[model samples]
Target: ALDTSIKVDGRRLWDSLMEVAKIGATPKGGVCRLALTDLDKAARDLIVGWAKAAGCTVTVDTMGNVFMRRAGRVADAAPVVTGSHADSQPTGGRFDGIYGVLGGLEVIRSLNDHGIETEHPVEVVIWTNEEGSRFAPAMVASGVFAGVFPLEYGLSRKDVDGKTIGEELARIGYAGDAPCGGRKLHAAFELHIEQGPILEAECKTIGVVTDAQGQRWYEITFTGQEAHAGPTPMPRRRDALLGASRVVDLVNRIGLDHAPYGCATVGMMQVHPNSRNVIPGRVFFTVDFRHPDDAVLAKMDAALRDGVARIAADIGLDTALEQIFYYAPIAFDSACVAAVRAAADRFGYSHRDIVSGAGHDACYLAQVAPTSMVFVPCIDGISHNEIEDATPAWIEAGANVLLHAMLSRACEPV
Candidate 1:
């Protein structure tokens, strides 16, 4: 066991967090640091300064991800890494992905304050576009780092405003020349607020996330004959909007029947010839489905396919559920999962092996590394909203646990 709460001045972390929180500074009292913007450059510079001050040699990848290496005591050893993104939605909470990164910084500083250096050098990383709220496809940079996404593919991605990620990376002064897949990771741990109410509702201090739920993201489109709203009889109308309506209601019903944690959402949509009097000829939208079990997700997908097709047939429309992105249920390494549980165990902290309902970078990282996430509670199970919040005690406890768990794993390697 380590000494009592190594005084790393979590306040420093809080201050850094507040500073970044103010850069894009949304009118909603949070932040809107869209990926690869001028504000994002400032944020990157600030973080690079912190890493440099901490004696790390920082570098960026082609996707513009920041990797600050605190090389291990042994020469030429791969470093253990920790961190997440700093990007946020147009209006997002301060602690969604930001807390993981700042908390990792706090852990490193805590080690520094005690003059306690690890045998293996540890690093903190800042992945680009984890939110991707302003851009398409989430976890853009990390996906590239892990080799799941090709570099060119990610760089070419454009935002709603038609700004390519590559163009913005240059615009924001972050187009790094470093190649991808160069990371030699020993292991990785992420610290984050639960963004949900589970731990708080249970009066717990920390959350030891076991695994992330299975997730499927789709881009759905529907087409039908357009007819004048007034001239088209109710039985004779071949309406795309009506078909889309049926699909949406079925998606909702499927999730409701699936149970408490199962979820489905329609992110966005557009209709061709969208007018009050004109019958929409074509309809387009997204269908996002998530479940903890693979079998369940598969069943849900099949149900969705049947529902979509049936609605199209009944409404005299053609339907397509284009599968753009997908990831099977990710179960984090048992060893990493145990470490988090052990940290909570030794500290006598309250926690549960919760399954994450939302998609996270950890789920993506787990594809290559033995990874786990530690969660603290956000008030009212709220997130991605202006009203999102969490308590200091919860934040501190979560960070401290991450520190121990990370140190524990780093000291004892595979």
Candidate 2:
């Protein structure tokens, strides 16, 4: 039987969330703390301080992944770790990344308040660079820890300004001597906003996440001759943007072609000599493709390559394409998933099994540890934007589930 009696403080959880929101807080009631920025450092310092005061020992790995641990009965046992990153996109919501981390804090605070102890040590991990907005390829630190990436790959990642993650970690004083990978865990859980409309539209309070989508990132550069826009003849001119537009249309077509689950986007673009009078000489853009199946992901990859070549050839442009990152589909651990579902049932929250449309650090952790996620409905299912919002009631419900799920796994009285 499951423990329906375990409960966490709802007001305390919401208050801590608001408290963290103040750091890099946005005017529109969101947050803008990019990874490895000074704002990130301040947030880290504040979270570490809270952990220390909560009777947890905090440690920093070489990749700046922070772990706050509370002791258990057995000294050598691995911890039941629950947490997500604190980093956000340049424009991000208050609850997207910060909620998971602070939610864990509330869980710890509840444990202390109730005077509860477990056989396995409990921990909250702040995975570095989960957003990947500042750094290319999200979840690099968790990838390294799961052995999907090497330690050097994570440290060597760079931002738009040519500063490496290693330099930034050192700059922020978070670069610890402990290497990035190989942390053992009893289990792992991540709580997050759904980042999509299904839960909200369906009127469900909790999402029992069963799996996450695969992601592929690509960068394409189109080269053409620059000429005066007014003087250039339409037939003779090699327009890079024209070729890029076809690919953009292809991106949209592929998303629709793949049906309800697949997604394609061209979120970032750069046009050379961007001016009214000058014809664009070069166009650089990014492709983000996601799907739940490896076969479909590969199919999308082939279609993208074929489409880019066809469009570039037809438009008289030289094209260069490179795939920067790829993460395969992830099916979460059944037992860990069941734990989350059990928590929801024990609490009487309406939930449905759903696959995540966004990539998360939990996807990489699932490669090594038994992992699952709990999600609450975001208002309008909006995330990765400045206007993303969620209600306090939903936040409290998700956190309560996170709390109990961790307890069900960590509190086995051995």
Candidate 3:
């Protein structure tokens, strides 16, 4: 029978969170442990040590994804897995990725204290690099695990310093012999901060995530003539920056046009020969568009391509558009989603169905296993920032839900 009486120690979870935060603690109380760095290695070692103390065996995959397993009554039964990435952004918060990880540990700790053995193994995974702050794309390790990306592609990804993921993993002593994917899982859950204000704004303690929005990433470059800024007449000049600026405005308009759900942004850009007196000869920028509806995302894509082409034509500049990455909208398993909802109801925590605005490791995991997520509110709906905060009560409540949710799937009457 599922045990409602068993509860996780919220205080212990909070203390562990604080202890790990100290490793990469920044001046503003944020963490800066980029993936595969010395600090990341230290954090991994600490987590491995803690897992060992809790009587969990650990395994590291070729991608450096860490899996800590607590044995079940049926040893060969696929494990019910729960986890999130341990790596953080350059200015990431304490709870953004680490909370889910430690929360999983706390679940194991709670079960151990109660002498509860699940029917299936309970595992906590610390995904390699979900931030993509050091690497170009986020969630590469999880993607590889789901077969969305090849193992070679994941290992070959490089940081700005030309450090490859494989080299860094070896440097950090995490390049394991185990394969990256092809393992079976009974179910998968990832508990995370909402990273937005919706739950907090609604005064809810938990968010039962049902679906994650699809994302499209684009890279654009505009090429024109570089001439003396002082001598070039405004109308006579083919200014690449001007062309790029028009597309920026167009991107914003497209977002506004798509209404409440559509989101578009030009996140990065560079101008060649960045100097005071030279007209920009070339400009490169990246565009991010996301929506819950695949059709709507396609519309946004069309608008972007059309707008960029028109801007380049009018300015007499050459342009290139490359779609670097894309993933379709995802609907989580109905049974898994209901387990989360039922757990929320069992604990009497106020929860409403919510859609994820950001990409997550769970989004990829959903491709291979029954998957869903639980969300707790962060102060001011802020994340990926130093001052991100969540009340201890809120933290306790979310873990309580996670505990019962996992139990619903992994536990059976003795």
Candidate 4:
């Protein structure tokens, strides 16, 4: 193994994160650079500038996936790629999507500092739309890059205001002619903050990601009669919100039934009628369910269907429930997994095998290349919120693991 002691500058890494945070800096110390927005453009420009200063070439694909490459001794060899997205959720934190991308940059910085040249080139990729808050479905660009979704599907995805990704990419001058995917790779790795509370709760510094959990996203609508809130008797009232309330409890129970890994959530909802005196006649809500096992996910699915049906029927409401997204659990490559584990061992960071609870660009990359992820603890495991945070020491430690692990893959490939 190469000297694992050679590592990234902790100060520089943390500074880069804070500097990027300035582009879309929110009042609450978070970032708000939604995908394809001007803020995202500024964020991309800053990173690209850093890559250029490092003597790396930058490339953007049709889906706006950006690749920053540093040459190796073997010019034509397939590069080992690493990175994450630059986009953020509406109330996004500074480090959520930014960490992996800058972590890759810091790896290159470390290599430059040590004057080490790998056998294969190293490419840092910033996948577009990993958050999918503005666009539907997360990891769209990586999905296209992995051939899981066609390029056109990703480009056609639109925001609530009806702006398509293709249109926005062009508007931002990132709609490149480069074809998406079909590129070879020695390996790919991503470093991210553990979006859940597991690592912190266990007092572990690192998470050796073994796989990503399966996911199912559903949208449901219920219809009942609208009536005066005060006048309508309990026996005569047909409240859609009442039906939805029961279904929410059922969703929670479904997850517990399959514990301790199964997860169920009702994240969004809409209630009809604006008046406080009116009983809600229609309700629309979304359900998100996840589990590591496909079979268990299926059981959760059946339970949701049966439970929703029961709730709607009992409340005398019409219903339309549609499953909009589903992805099977992913098992990462053994060699890549070993690399991350070995790096953690070398660094003496406490770690345990973990299954990813949230979707990531790395999950899509797993379809096209050998891929694994390194996860460091986030403060209290809070993420996807403005207050999301992590210690600089933990951040630096995770990035160091990423550097050594990626070097092991890119420097001495078999």
Clashes of each: 2, 0, 1, 0
Ranking by lDDT: 3, 4, 2, 1
Each candidate structure's TM-score, on Cα atoms with residue i matched to residue i, is 0.93, 0.97, 0.95, 0.94
Candidate 1 similarity to native, TM-score: 0.93
> Where does the lowest 10-residue lDDT sum fall in candidate 4?
1-10
RMSD of 4: 2.0
Total clashes in model 4, counting residue pairs 3 or more apart in sequence or in different chains: 0
Pick by TM-score: 3 or 4, better one: 3
Task: Give the per-residue lDDT digits (tens) of candidate 2, residues 220-327.
Answer: 999987889897888888889888888999999999999988899998889988887887889999899999998999999999999999998887899999998998
Q: Candidate 4, after superposition: displacement of residue 215 in Å?
A: 0.9
Candidate 2 stretches with Cα past 4 Å from truth are 1-4
Better of 2 and 3 by TM-score: 2
The most accurate candidate by TM-score is 2
- Model 1 regions more than 4 Å off: 5-7, 225-227
Runs in model 3 lying further than 4 Å from the true structure: 1-4, 412-414
User: After best superposition, candidate 1 residue 199: deviation in angstroms?
Assistant: 0.6
lDDT of 3 by residue, 1-414 (tens): 344688889999999999999989999999999999999999999999999999999999999999999999997898899999889988889999899999999999998988988999999999998887688677899999999999999999898679999999999999988899899989999999999999999999999999999999888989999999997889989989989999999999999999999999997888987787899999998898999999999999999999899999999999889987789899998999999999888877899999999889999999999999999999999998999999998889889889988988888532
Worst 10 residues of 1 by lDDT: 1-10
